[PDB]
Design a protein around this ligand. Sequence first.
Ligand SMILES: Nc1ncnc2c1ncn2[C@@H]1O[C@H](COP(=O)(O)CP(=O)(O)OP(=O)(O)O)[C@@H](O)[C@H]1O
Ligand SMILES: Nc1nc2c(c(=O)[nH]1)N=C(CO)CN2
Ligand SMILES: [Cl-]
Ligand SMILES: [Mg+2]
Ligand SMILES: [Mg+2]
Length: 158
Amino acid sequence: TVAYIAIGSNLASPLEQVNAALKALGDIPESHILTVSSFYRTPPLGPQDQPDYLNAAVALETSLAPEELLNHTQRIELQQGRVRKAERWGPRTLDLDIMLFGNEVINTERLTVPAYDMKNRGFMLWPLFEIAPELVFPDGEMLRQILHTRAFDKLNKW
Ligand SMILES: Nc1ncnc2c1ncn2[C@@H]1O[C@H](COP(=O)(O)CP(=O)(O)OP(=O)(O)O)[C@@H](O)[C@H]1O
Ligand SMILES: Nc1nc2c(c(=O)[nH]1)N=C(CO)CN2
Ligand SMILES: [Cl-]
Ligand SMILES: [Mg+2]
Ligand SMILES: [Mg+2]
């Protein structure tokens, strides 16, 4: 299955964090990286008292079940010093969000796929479009068309 994973970081040297995350993602069992996006510098969504983010996206081929993939992405966040604050949308060393897990629709307590807010976020859609321009969502929408409709600002390279 092709999983598309969003990467974000705005603490503790985001470029190093993203590079470390990519290495670690490739080391996940029964999985391998297919494609990686460019790195983008994006202003924070949410509270404005935090640094700009490095955002990227990666396509990962995996034979893991989705929740087992989640266990592994969460482990990588923790290995990279992720600390979860009280405030929503606050800063973090590393954030790995499963945007899509093949064409699956998943609704559980731990996991919602497609990622619940991705269609509203240029910092998720643009890096995804760079690596999967032909992508169609489980609901039948084309990524290319969602981008056309929303006309989100284009991103700047990190
Ligand atoms: N598709 C998905 N990818 C990753 N985590 C997901 C997820 N769907 C649900 N979750 C859940 O989201 C919980 C909180 O994850 P956090 O990383 O702290 C939220 P965040 O990514 O900072 O904000 P955001 O979801 O608004 O982007 C996790 O413990 C996980 O169970
Ligand atoms: N620019 C940007 N802003 C955010 C991001 C993110 O990845 N990029 N993620 C958030 C919660 O996960 C908080 N707001
Ligand atoms: Cl969808
Ligand atoms: Mg997250
Ligand atoms: Mg997130």
